[PDB]
């Protein structure tokens, strides 16, 4: 059957740690799991470029989208087809937050592009690890737009987003995530 | 105000040669010219990623679009703003023909992606060098070749369809003939 779960938030919100703890939880339960991430899960070279290059928001988004399109087709959908729980550390909501709310691109266009890039694939649950930019493990105005952008996305889809306080101890966050996930297993 | 011109067609149709000769002709008319190309005129690294093995048509198109977005923004629009004739060896019609007609991606999606990527910028004229597909698998090239001709049928004022098998000098003179009413 397969279950698709994502993690989202600012860099340093503990997403990689929590994706690893979630994967381990599922391993403990005997449930096959695939852990993956964006950018780079589709086209690793995109990650390397976005690291080095200054690009227009449109070009940045379109590169992210290409990576995502490959990621969905070659990694995520085949994992789900095998009945795995697939966890992605970042997915489309990251582009919406950073390129949309952060860099100002219009959301309906972002979503139209994404419609064919993702083959319409949506996470069943998305865990947003919310904190102020100053708490992540001026220049801050961008990151505040992104943080508020994520909160905006979450309030628009309360049936998909679970918003957690990312400044809580690591173990407590993991237990909150497990609690939210248990009904879906 | 500038003038935006493109060349299109199958690879080996002589597009690069015609782009070059066109730039020369225009400079001889005292017109400043910017000669550019896709892929690579926006993000030269897109050429490596484009060769990625078994790349999905969607990913391929999105890669071309990223380069195209940077190309329009950083090269072509600033060129036009400076009053240059900008000639691009390939532009959006390349994606529509190859990724749309060839690889089967839906045209309306290709266009909606392109709307922001290109900021609606369209060439005044596009010279389509129509080449037999066996000269460019063959089934793919036949779709692409025919796809281009469909595009040209659909926008008959913008497209100038030329026989790629004619001598270079004849093609160049035909391009020159279509351009004279846009020059003083």
XYZ file of C-alpha atoms in Angstrom:
369
model
C 0.000 0.000 0.000
C 2.689 2.537 1.029
C 2.486 5.677 3.158
C 4.172 8.971 2.201
C 5.260 11.271 5.022
C 7.281 14.485 4.910
C 9.191 16.750 7.228
C 9.401 20.515 6.737
C 10.764 23.608 8.508
C 13.706 25.955 8.490
C 17.193 24.428 8.265
C 18.240 23.601 11.872
C 14.679 22.807 12.961
C 15.782 19.167 13.613
C 14.236 17.660 10.474
C 17.037 15.297 9.648
C 17.204 14.108 13.288
C 13.448 13.561 13.385
C 13.327 11.835 9.981
C 15.990 9.423 11.302
C 14.124 8.849 14.553
C 10.883 8.274 12.651
C 12.547 5.798 10.378
C 13.953 3.968 13.411
C 10.546 3.875 15.072
C 9.080 2.237 11.995
C 12.011 -0.215 11.810
C 11.287 -1.179 15.452
C 7.697 -1.950 14.377
C 8.835 -4.154 11.481
C 7.539 -1.747 8.865
C 9.626 -1.326 5.687
C 10.790 2.295 5.362
C 12.729 4.423 2.846
C 14.316 7.643 4.000
C 15.003 10.282 1.330
C 15.522 14.068 1.012
C 15.308 17.092 -1.235
C 17.115 18.690 -2.848
C 19.220 15.951 -4.468
C 17.101 12.828 -4.080
C 16.287 13.052 -7.786
C 19.204 14.865 -9.445
C 22.156 15.035 -7.025
C 23.887 17.529 -9.282
C 21.058 20.007 -8.697
C 21.855 20.102 -4.995
C 25.520 20.821 -5.837
C 24.551 23.641 -8.214
C 22.030 25.305 -5.922
C 24.917 25.267 -3.376
C 27.257 27.258 -5.701
C 24.912 29.410 -7.956
C 23.041 32.746 -7.753
C 19.868 32.288 -9.781
C 16.550 34.107 -10.334
C 13.783 32.709 -8.061
C 12.113 31.268 -11.196
C 15.227 29.371 -12.285
C 15.846 28.202 -8.677
C 12.330 26.854 -8.475
C 12.491 25.171 -11.874
C 15.726 23.382 -10.918
C 14.241 22.226 -7.643
C 11.254 21.038 -9.682
C 13.365 19.003 -12.047
C 15.075 17.350 -9.120
C 11.678 16.740 -7.566
C 10.258 15.246 -10.733
C 13.070 12.723 -10.895
C 12.845 12.099 -7.151
C 9.128 11.273 -7.306
C 9.488 8.982 -10.324
C 12.684 7.155 -9.554
C 12.654 7.012 -5.710
C 9.421 7.885 -4.004
C 6.765 6.253 -6.214
C 8.734 3.025 -6.552
C 9.184 2.878 -2.747
C 5.456 3.401 -2.215
C 4.646 0.781 -4.870
C 6.603 -1.717 -2.796
C 4.501 -0.856 0.264
C 7.232 1.121 2.052
C 6.656 4.056 4.307
C 8.570 6.737 2.396
C 9.805 9.715 4.453
C 11.122 12.732 2.633
C 13.186 15.353 4.467
C 11.655 18.245 2.432
C 9.206 18.066 -0.441
C 7.070 20.553 -2.407
C 6.151 22.644 0.648
C 9.819 23.627 0.955
C 9.696 25.274 -2.529
C 6.398 26.933 -1.701
C 7.785 28.331 1.526
C 11.246 29.391 0.311
C 10.624 30.276 -3.352
C 6.978 31.335 -2.914
C 6.653 33.102 0.435
C 10.408 33.833 0.726
C 11.398 34.893 -2.805
C 7.924 36.110 -3.820
C 6.908 33.688 -6.640
C 3.178 33.300 -7.142
C 1.780 30.205 -5.451
C -0.743 29.230 -8.105
C 1.984 29.091 -10.752
C 4.229 27.127 -8.368
C 1.465 24.595 -7.886
C 0.649 24.306 -11.633
C 4.328 23.521 -12.329
C 4.339 21.030 -9.450
C 1.160 19.324 -10.680
C 3.067 17.351 -13.427
C 6.428 17.384 -11.667
C 4.999 15.395 -8.753
C 2.367 13.367 -10.700
C -0.052 14.803 -8.098
C 1.661 12.926 -5.257
C 0.887 14.492 -1.862
C 2.177 13.392 1.565
C -0.510 11.846 3.826
C 1.075 13.724 6.747
C 3.611 16.512 6.867
C 5.392 17.339 10.139
C 6.299 20.987 10.337
C 9.006 21.748 12.905
C 8.292 25.305 13.687
C 10.696 27.774 15.241
C 11.820 31.349 14.833
C 14.865 31.730 12.538
C 16.977 32.757 15.548
C 16.305 29.354 17.200
C 17.416 27.212 14.255
C 20.244 24.818 15.239
C 18.405 42.170 8.154
C 19.008 38.696 6.661
C 16.373 37.450 9.118
C 13.511 39.052 7.169
C 13.737 36.428 4.437
C 13.745 33.599 6.935
C 10.789 35.114 8.765
C 8.849 35.158 5.476
C 9.681 31.472 5.030
C 8.701 30.587 8.611
C 5.364 32.471 8.282
C 4.904 30.962 4.825
C 5.165 27.465 6.338
C 2.632 28.421 9.072
C 0.365 29.741 6.362
C 0.552 26.487 4.413
C -0.154 24.533 7.596
C -3.299 26.472 8.518
C -4.612 26.049 4.961
C -4.273 22.230 5.194
C -4.846 21.212 8.857
C -5.683 17.656 7.819
C -2.177 17.185 6.354
C 0.078 19.353 8.520
C 1.076 18.597 12.108
C 2.841 21.637 13.580
C 5.369 20.885 16.360
C 7.422 23.159 18.517
C 10.901 22.532 17.167
C 12.566 23.928 20.320
C 11.253 21.014 22.429
C 13.679 18.264 23.440
C 14.421 15.914 20.623
C 12.826 12.883 22.317
C 9.571 14.660 23.031
C 9.220 15.810 19.393
C 9.724 12.186 18.281
C 7.028 10.930 20.635
C 4.591 13.635 19.358
C 5.307 12.500 15.792
C 4.760 8.848 16.767
C 1.486 9.741 18.497
C 0.193 11.516 15.389
C 1.276 8.659 13.162
C -0.074 5.651 15.139
C -3.669 5.793 13.750
C -2.217 5.509 10.187
C -0.496 2.110 10.819
C 12.990 48.592 -28.228
C 15.075 45.722 -29.777
C 14.041 42.875 -32.056
C 13.967 39.251 -30.896
C 14.611 36.516 -33.527
C 14.989 32.771 -33.134
C 16.111 29.754 -35.074
C 14.473 26.369 -34.695
C 14.515 22.932 -36.224
C 16.116 19.512 -35.944
C 19.855 19.246 -35.042
C 22.017 19.168 -38.162
C 19.436 21.342 -39.961
C 22.006 24.261 -40.164
C 20.491 26.508 -37.442
C 23.822 27.517 -35.929
C 25.238 28.457 -39.365
C 22.118 30.515 -40.186
C 22.165 32.231 -36.796
C 25.756 33.245 -37.451
C 25.194 34.551 -40.995
C 22.137 36.448 -39.792
C 24.186 38.247 -37.122
C 26.664 39.234 -39.857
C 23.952 40.510 -42.229
C 22.466 42.669 -39.427
C 25.793 44.097 -38.380
C 26.434 45.020 -42.040
C 23.108 46.988 -41.831
C 24.589 48.856 -38.804
C 22.470 46.898 -36.262
C 24.083 45.902 -32.908
C 23.406 42.167 -32.348
C 23.553 39.716 -29.457
C 23.914 36.086 -30.568
C 22.883 33.506 -27.957
C 21.622 29.921 -27.735
C 19.755 27.316 -25.730
C 20.477 25.174 -23.903
C 23.082 27.026 -21.954
C 22.639 30.705 -22.547
C 21.119 31.123 -19.048
C 22.664 28.339 -16.996
C 25.606 26.758 -18.805
C 25.547 23.866 -16.288
C 22.142 22.776 -17.603
C 23.923 21.085 -20.532
C 25.509 18.434 -18.188
C 22.278 17.746 -16.265
C 20.383 17.456 -19.589
C 22.348 14.359 -20.560
C 21.422 12.525 -17.322
C 20.615 8.827 -18.169
C 16.886 7.967 -18.400
C 15.812 11.492 -17.424
C 12.032 11.875 -17.250
C 10.519 14.139 -19.944
C 9.150 16.344 -17.131
C 12.555 16.721 -15.473
C 14.120 17.367 -18.890
C 11.611 20.114 -19.636
C 12.027 21.668 -16.179
C 15.802 21.769 -16.690
C 15.416 23.520 -20.085
C 12.965 25.902 -18.395
C 15.390 26.802 -15.592
C 18.050 27.697 -18.153
C 15.410 29.490 -20.242
C 14.266 31.539 -17.197
C 17.808 32.745 -16.484
C 18.470 33.296 -20.194
C 15.454 35.534 -20.653
C 16.081 37.494 -17.469
C 19.819 37.981 -17.609
C 20.673 37.900 -21.273
C 17.794 38.353 -23.653
C 15.636 41.070 -21.951
C 18.684 43.228 -21.065
C 19.864 42.884 -24.693
C 16.498 44.001 -26.077
C 16.363 46.828 -23.538
C 19.644 48.109 -24.972
C 18.146 48.138 -28.477
C 19.997 45.055 -29.759
C 18.782 42.540 -32.242
C 18.902 39.372 -30.083
C 19.129 36.125 -31.990
C 18.666 32.868 -30.162
C 19.656 29.549 -31.602
C 16.720 27.671 -30.044
C 14.094 28.989 -27.694
C 10.784 27.798 -26.253
C 9.572 26.128 -29.462
C 12.489 23.696 -29.128
C 10.952 22.389 -25.866
C 7.436 22.319 -27.307
C 8.641 20.274 -30.319
C 11.072 17.924 -28.491
C 9.539 17.513 -25.001
C 5.940 18.072 -26.117
C 5.509 16.489 -29.538
C 8.563 14.162 -29.207
C 8.411 12.999 -25.586
C 4.643 13.480 -25.206
C 4.363 16.146 -22.503
C 1.038 18.032 -22.509
C 1.414 21.376 -24.368
C -0.776 23.479 -22.080
C 1.447 22.530 -19.052
C 4.553 23.340 -21.051
C 3.029 26.731 -21.787
C 1.930 27.562 -18.240
C 5.421 26.702 -16.972
C 6.827 28.956 -19.709
C 4.562 31.913 -18.914
C 6.737 32.979 -15.869
C 9.937 31.412 -17.176
C 9.863 33.584 -20.338
C 7.823 36.442 -18.813
C 5.696 36.124 -21.968
C 8.588 37.076 -24.245
C 8.011 35.845 -27.801
C 10.279 36.217 -30.865
C 9.020 38.565 -33.601
C 10.061 35.924 -36.177
C 11.238 32.343 -35.876
C 13.047 30.714 -38.795
C 12.187 27.010 -38.800
C 14.706 25.001 -40.754
C 12.645 22.016 -41.787
C 14.876 18.938 -42.069
C 13.902 15.382 -42.992
C 13.944 13.385 -39.771
C 16.376 10.725 -41.045
C 18.929 13.497 -41.530
C 18.647 14.724 -37.831
C 15.112 6.693 -32.821
C 13.512 7.795 -36.073
C 9.955 7.604 -34.675
C 10.951 10.343 -32.185
C 12.493 12.602 -34.822
C 9.486 12.212 -37.057
C 7.229 13.428 -34.165
C 9.541 16.349 -33.474
C 9.782 17.326 -37.131
C 5.997 17.228 -37.518
C 5.548 18.975 -34.155
C 7.550 21.889 -35.403
C 5.438 22.081 -38.539
C 2.300 22.116 -36.358
C 3.687 24.954 -34.308
C 4.383 26.826 -37.537
C 0.856 26.180 -38.871
C -0.539 27.492 -35.603
C 1.456 30.791 -35.687
C 1.865 31.431 -39.350
C 2.949 35.078 -38.946
C 5.749 34.244 -36.503
C 7.150 31.144 -38.180
C 9.020 31.270 -41.476
C 9.357 27.675 -42.673
C 12.427 26.989 -44.792
C 13.737 23.882 -46.534
C 16.892 22.890 -44.536
C 18.228 20.913 -47.564
C 18.632 24.084 -49.675
C 22.165 25.511 -50.123
C 23.152 27.627 -47.035
C 23.333 30.819 -49.149
C 19.772 30.384 -50.389
C 18.458 29.839 -46.883
C 20.338 32.934 -45.726
C 18.953 35.024 -48.555
C 15.397 33.824 -47.657
C 15.934 34.789 -44.018
C 17.194 38.198 -45.204
C 14.056 38.646 -47.425
C 11.651 38.032 -44.501
C 13.675 40.426 -42.316
C 13.762 43.432 -44.673
C 10.223 44.723 -43.740
C 11.289 44.752 -40.063
C 14.359 46.845 -40.901
C 14.187 50.449 -42.097
